[PDB]
Design an enzyme around this catalytic site. Structure first.
Site, PDB file in Angstrom:
ATOM      1  N   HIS A 123      -1.324   7.925   0.337  1.00  0.00           N
ATOM      2  CA  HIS A 123      -1.687   7.933   1.752  1.00  0.00           C
ATOM      3  C   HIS A 123      -2.722   9.015   2.055  1.00  0.00           C
ATOM      4  O   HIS A 123      -2.693   9.636   3.117  1.00  0.00           O
ATOM      5  CB  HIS A 123      -0.448   8.104   2.636  1.00  0.00           C
ATOM      6  N   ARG A 147     -11.609   8.071   4.975  1.00  0.00           N
ATOM      7  CA  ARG A 147     -12.265   9.124   5.759  1.00  0.00           C
ATOM      8  C   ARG A 147     -13.782   9.036   5.771  1.00  0.00           C
ATOM      9  O   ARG A 147     -14.370   9.163   6.865  1.00  0.00           O
ATOM     10  CB  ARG A 147     -11.810  10.498   5.246  1.00  0.00           C
ATOM     11  N   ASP A 164      -6.709   4.374  -3.835  1.00  0.00           N
ATOM     12  CA  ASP A 164      -7.535   5.113  -2.891  1.00  0.00           C
ATOM     13  C   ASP A 164      -7.183   6.590  -2.986  1.00  0.00           C
ATOM     14  O   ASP A 164      -6.349   7.001  -3.800  1.00  0.00           O
ATOM     15  CB  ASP A 164      -7.397   4.552  -1.466  1.00  0.00           C
ATOM     16  N   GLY A 201      -9.641  10.102  -1.968  1.00  0.00           N
ATOM     17  CA  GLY A 201     -10.691  10.959  -2.473  1.00  0.00           C
ATOM     18  C   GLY A 201     -11.877  10.261  -3.100  1.00  0.00           C
ATOM     19  O   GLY A 201     -12.698  10.933  -3.733  1.00  0.00           O
ATOM     20  N   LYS A 240       0.842  -1.187   0.000  1.00  0.00           N
ATOM     21  CA  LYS A 240       0.000   0.000   0.000  1.00  0.00           C
ATOM     22  C   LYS A 240       0.880   1.241   0.000  1.00  0.00           C
ATOM     23  O   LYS A 240       1.704   1.420   0.903  1.00  0.00           O
ATOM     24  CB  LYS A 240      -0.941   0.011   1.203  1.00  0.00           C
ATOM     25  N   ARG A 249      -1.128  12.279   2.999  1.00  0.00           N
ATOM     26  CA  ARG A 249      -0.637  12.410   4.366  1.00  0.00           C
ATOM     27  C   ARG A 249       0.844  12.097   4.520  1.00  0.00           C
ATOM     28  O   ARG A 249       1.402  12.347   5.595  1.00  0.00           O
ATOM     29  CB  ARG A 249      -1.443  11.503   5.311  1.00  0.00           C
TER      30      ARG A 249
HETATM   31  C1  LIG Z   1      -6.810   9.442  10.071  1.00  0.00           C
HETATM   32  C2  LIG Z   1      -6.181   8.615   9.142  1.00  0.00           C
HETATM   33  C3  LIG Z   1      -5.417   7.542   9.580  1.00  0.00           C
HETATM   34  C4  LIG Z   1      -4.791   6.716   8.653  1.00  0.00           C
HETATM   35  C5  LIG Z   1      -4.894   6.968   7.283  1.00  0.00           C
HETATM   36  C6  LIG Z   1      -5.687   8.024   6.856  1.00  0.00           C
HETATM   37  C7  LIG Z   1      -6.314   8.852   7.779  1.00  0.00           C
HETATM   38  C8  LIG Z   1      -7.074   9.916   7.316  1.00  0.00           C
HETATM   39  N1  LIG Z   1      -4.321   6.149   6.375  1.00  0.00           N
HETATM   40  C9  LIG Z   1      -4.621   6.316   4.919  1.00  0.00           C
HETATM   41  C10 LIG Z   1      -5.762   5.417   4.422  1.00  0.00           C
HETATM   42  O1  LIG Z   1      -5.367   4.051   4.522  1.00  0.00           O
HETATM   43  C11 LIG Z   1      -6.090   5.712   2.952  1.00  0.00           C
HETATM   44  O2  LIG Z   1      -4.903   5.646   2.157  1.00  0.00           O
HETATM   45  C12 LIG Z   1      -6.705   7.096   2.774  1.00  0.00           C
HETATM   46  O3  LIG Z   1      -7.603   7.387   3.847  1.00  0.00           O
HETATM   47  C13 LIG Z   1      -7.464   7.090   1.446  1.00  0.00           C
HETATM   48  O4  LIG Z   1      -7.931   8.400   1.162  1.00  0.00           O
HETATM   49  P1  LIG Z   1      -9.402   8.851   1.628  1.00  0.00           P
HETATM   50  O5  LIG Z   1      -9.522   9.127   3.084  1.00  0.00           O
HETATM   51  O6  LIG Z   1      -9.739  10.143   0.721  1.00  0.00           O
HETATM   52  O7  LIG Z   1     -10.439   7.698   1.156  1.00  0.00           O
HETATM   53  C14 LIG Z   1      -3.532   5.139   6.784  1.00  0.00           C
HETATM   54  N2  LIG Z   1      -3.001   4.312   5.865  1.00  0.00           N
HETATM   55  C15 LIG Z   1      -2.186   3.311   6.223  1.00  0.00           C
HETATM   56  O8  LIG Z   1      -1.725   2.550   5.371  1.00  0.00           O
HETATM   57  N3  LIG Z   1      -1.884   3.123   7.573  1.00  0.00           N
HETATM   58  C16 LIG Z   1      -2.451   3.978   8.523  1.00  0.00           C
HETATM   59  O9  LIG Z   1      -2.149   3.848   9.709  1.00  0.00           O
HETATM   60  C17 LIG Z   1      -3.120   5.115   8.116  1.00  0.00           C
HETATM   61  O10 LIG Z   1      -2.066   6.083   8.157  1.00  0.00           O
HETATM   62  N4  LIG Z   1      -4.058   5.683   9.082  1.00  0.00           N
END
Ligand SMILES: Cc1cc2c(cc1C)N(C[C@H](O)[C@H](O)[C@H](O)COP(=O)(O)O)C1=NC(=O)NC(=O)[C@]1(O)N2
Ligand SMILES: Cc1cc2c(cc1C)N(C[C@H](O)[C@H](O)[C@H](O)COP(=O)(O)O)C1=NC(=O)NC(=O)[C@]1(O)N2
Ligand SMILES: Cc1cc2c(cc1C)N(C[C@H](O)[C@H](O)[C@H](O)COP(=O)(O)O)C1=NC(=O)NC(=O)[C@]1(O)N2
Ligand SMILES: Cc1cc2c(cc1C)N(C[C@H](O)[C@H](O)[C@H](O)COP(=O)(O)O)C1=NC(=O)NC(=O)[C@]1(O)N2
Lengths: 314, 314, 314, 314
Positions: C211, C266, C242, C244, C187, C214
């Site tokens: 991510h 989210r 992933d 958005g 991922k 992020r």
């Molecule tokens: C609060 C939070 C926590 C995590 C992540 C995203 C948010 C917003 N994410 C990203 C999530 O997995 C998706 O990549 C992303 O949310 C898609 O975008 P979206 O929100 O527009 O649908 C993580 N990814 C990991 O692999 N491990 C984690 O601990 C994680 O950091 N925790």
């Protein structure tokens, strides 16, 4: 720039007549957006001992790669009207285009001296139009600027049309060309093949122009067609451009895209409405300085060098 | 970032002198918009045991792919002026470019130690300019940063020009090159063939720069020309870039486009106006951390790996 | 959509933790702008007697081309936390990714049943990480979602990390792959050659992801790299995406670009903060209906047909 | 233009029914943005002695390259409803498309005379749909406008469906084609191969349309697919387009992209809500004048010449 603020203050719907475009005014705004997305690639470390903004066009020297665009009824903006603009243009060494709908007779404008051009609107009686051409040539005008992009006005008064309409065709162009020894300049060319045909038809120049966005709404901006038209003409005639030229950097952009010169319309009227002849001479002085500065910063000692600058679209 | 808010509060038109560009400031904004549309394609799962932001440039190690850009009259922003910035730069391991118009003499700046570069403005007496080069080389400066994009200033005070103008040509460049053993770095190169000629002329580096949008208004942003220039130079000299570098991600973007290093100008002054030498060291510390973070997230253990990252335009 | 309004009302900086991106959040916004400029070319007049949104992935049927993205500490948003989301996901037939930093132990989540995936963060002790993999596989998890784009967090609490860090390399990937019979899914892949190498390394899938904006600020959006990565992988592994995904039309866009499935992060949390498990099941029901509607309007009886849709960029 | 202001004033949620699109309404806005970025390259100096906006389509002359788009329940906007619009359309020489969900029976509309087309929605009983086709053909309708892009409505009342649903397939198309001698026109074609197949299936025309952005949200605008579809069809059938046509310049843009004619939907309803039949005739008069003006300024004596105009995207 700040000049238009002064023109707005001083009446009010005459302003909208001067500033407006046709329809949604999409071509009016597009003239500016087209210029704003052109970027110049300047050259460095070239000798600038004698930076000159002068060009030769139609066998005569001009102080700048610029002429005053034909704008009708210049007494709408100031009591001196066209006489004021023509005097400042003469003093600045830039050609002045006498409009067919001038609020002062063309012979009076030509008497001011300088480098008068005459813009012809085709009248539905052919020999009235050809008489206008003869009057211009007799009066010492140096070029016939045949406005072609007005078969009719694209979708008030006062004060007068002191020189006193039909669609102009390629036959009308040949009639003018046969009737004068002056260079014939077709104003309002946008299609590449119209530019090629203009050379074949014996034109001495063309103005790549969508009429400041005042004829066909949705017509491509002239600056967007300039480079293609310059390549197609291959030096066969002078290629001018107008529409949204608001600075010396804009003049530089136009010349870098291949233009021989630009026409400037609305800003010259703002300078006429605010401070008359002295205001026009002021604008021409400011433009002359900006052109000189832009050319030097771009590494160009001459307008010809400026024509060899490369550009990038942003 | 928040630093500029502190610089704005603390006088007021000195700010506009520091922040402003020439003309419509179209090239100033374009430096930023160009950086904002570059996207980095990060690499994953590479060993990061020893991520290092160090580079070798002009035979000397630097802690970051960054140097302080030449900015004139640094006592306009803080009483310590250039001495404060030069001290923080030395402590951070980044080169500091001494400006020809520095409000403290160049020998005093060079005495601070570190990696002083000297930015040369061509004076109309050739031997005054070459004397400035000799003083810089005698003072231990490591490079001559020949500013080429200022034949004259693109379109107040106080406090002093403590080191005490004409257009610089390729002849001026050869005169400097013959007069020094230091690498000569041409600042303000935007045309691909000017970059090639710079290598042919014996330059040790170039700075791809439109002077922070302060010379030719409408000049292409340096970041837009960087990749083309890097390919054309083919390692023949160092290629630096400046204009709008505001973060470690921006440094990464510049290096991914092929730059050897960036110059940082205005932000270093904000850090000088707010909290003096400690404020500059703060900025350099923050930038050093952001560069290190950006490089690791992008999978780059070294700046050289960062130069091999691909980008996409958005 | 309106769900995020409910999540905002109900605390306040926990919201910013959930919604935020790194740095300038340029990659967070770019995920959305990238999706908004993709247009689908629908097909007409095809038989839709049995439109099905089901896919097979990792040898198991899913009700939608979608799984719940790994999000840490889901009790930050609702007292039921991960148990609520996992239950709704199970009921909806969509896989649920257990996060390494889950506020409820992974064995409890897996006990809910359904299709649990386990997201692994590499710990600096290798055998702690491999123990986590063993616990997940013993607990009936169906895939190891190896998060690779976090060597460290890209630039508070409470309540717990109920399952209890170093950069993951390709060696770490091989260690996991050798330690499990479950498909390994990487991922955070954005580079085309990282996708190819992922297949060579024996991965069963990749998630094309920055991510959610992020990690690296300025990283290209995954949706912008999706089509290139799908072509390069040539069916060698599952390609998820992933970032958005906010509607069934977005799912359709992702599948038309070649994705096997999307992750949703989210929005699932907004549905958890507002109305708990019932709220998540509501969101999954709405998404299931939108996907079905979008697919039918696009002329696709199956997700595979949706993958063969053409797109145009606007 | 100003007409929609009058339609808004006069009830209120009926407006939103008329103006709205599906989902985020991204395809509704995109119809307009697509038209706004098309620029026409006008031709100059051509003979305009007899500029005519007339076309032949389906063996019958029309006064304009335009027909009234099928809009359901036109008594929602004015008590005269469809009878008013059909009368004004007849007087203007433009075809009128009778909607399957018309608030006045189709035989009454056809009795108004003029050039009635009938828009068919497929009903789940095949022979009910084919009966509707027979009624239309018996009533003197000149074309069957088979709406294909509605297998179901893309994501109130009153007053009646005076003529009294399933997904339409290529089999449904062949059933209609076998049941009528009228040209069959498929409305809602966006894919190039659907356009080719439409010709193979014996259609007399297609309407390149995303249903005014009311079916698939995120569907490409028809104007963006028009030129590709025209080339692929190679004169095999008539190619119409709709969506966001708001002026004669828009009609010119559509014809320059290759369309045989446009459909106009929402504006005709605004003219119906404000001033009934006289208001529709007013709109058709204004559109007729704008089309004639745009064509002349573009140098086109005929619609066929307008189809040979080149365009540039901005
Ligand atoms: C609060 C939070 C926590 C995590 C992540 C995203 C948010 C917003 N994410 C990203 C999530 O997995 C998706 O990549 C992303 O949310 C898609 O975008 P979206 O929100 O527009 O649908 C993580 N990814 C990991 O692999 N491990 C984690 O601990 C994680 O950091 N925790
Ligand atoms: C008020 C007015 C009057 C005219 C023109 C333009 C304005 C604004 N123009 C257009 C002008 O010649 C330049 O094409 C344009 O002004 C350049 O754009 P700009 O203003 O941004 O510099 C004319 N052109 C003709 O050929 N004959 C005319 O009677 C003319 O219609 N009268
Ligand atoms: C106030 C001031 C003064 C100077 C310069 C820039 C500013 C803002 N600059 C431009 C600077 O060296 C970088 O090119 C630019 O600042 C990068 O852009 P950035 O600020 O977004 O990081 C100069 N350059 C020279 O060569 N000689 C000089 O005397 C100099 O004119 N003085
Ligand atoms: C209120 C309403 C009703 C219908 C349609 C559009 C609106 C706004 N439309 C779309 C219309 O035919 C044009 O495609 C569109 O209006 C062009 O875009 P425009 O309004 O910018 O000019 C229909 N199409 C069908 O085939 N059958 C129908 O029942 C129909 O759904 N009823």
């Amino acid at each position: 720039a700040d000049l238009e603020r002064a023109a707005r203050d001083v009446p009010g719907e005459i302003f909208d007549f001067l500033a407006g475009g046709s329809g949604t005014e999409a071509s009016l705004v597009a003239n500016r957006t087209a210029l704003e997305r052109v970027f110049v690639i300047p050259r460095m470390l070239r000798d600038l001992t004698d930076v000159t903004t002068e060009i030769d066009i139609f066998g005569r020297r001009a102080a700048l790669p610029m002429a005053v665009a034909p704008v009708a009824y210049q007494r709408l903006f100031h009591p001196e009207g066209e006489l004021a603009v023509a005097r400042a243009a003469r003093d600045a060494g830039v050609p002045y285009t006498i409009c067919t709908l001038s609020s002062v007779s063309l012979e009076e404008i030509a008497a001011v001296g300088g480098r008068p051009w005459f813009q012809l609107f085709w009248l539905r009686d052919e020999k009235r139009s050809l008489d206008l051409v003869r009057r211009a040539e007799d009066a010492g005008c140096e070029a016939i600027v045949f406005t072609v992009d007005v078969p009719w006005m694209g979708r008030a008064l006062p004060v007068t049309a002191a020189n006193f309409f039909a669609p102009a065709t390629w036959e009308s162009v040949e009639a003018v060309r046969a009737h004068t020894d002056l260079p014939v300049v077709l104003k309002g060319i946008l299609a590449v093949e119209d530019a090629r045909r203009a050379v074949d038809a014996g034109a001495g120049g063309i103005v790549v122009s969508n009429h400041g966005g005042r004829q066909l709404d949705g017509a491509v901006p002239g600056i967007e067609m300039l480079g293609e038209i310059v390549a197609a003409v291959s030096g066969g005639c002078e290629v001018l451009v107008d529409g949204g030229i608001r600075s010396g950097g804009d003049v530089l952009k136009a010349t870098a895209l291949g233009a021989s010169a630009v026409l400037v319309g609305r800003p010259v009227m703002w300078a006429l409405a605010a401070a008359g002849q002295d205001g026009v001479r002021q604008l021409l002085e400011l433009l002359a300085e900006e052109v000189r500065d832009a050319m030097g910063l771009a590494g160009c000692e001459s307008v010809g060098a400026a024509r060899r600058l490369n550009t990038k679209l942003g």
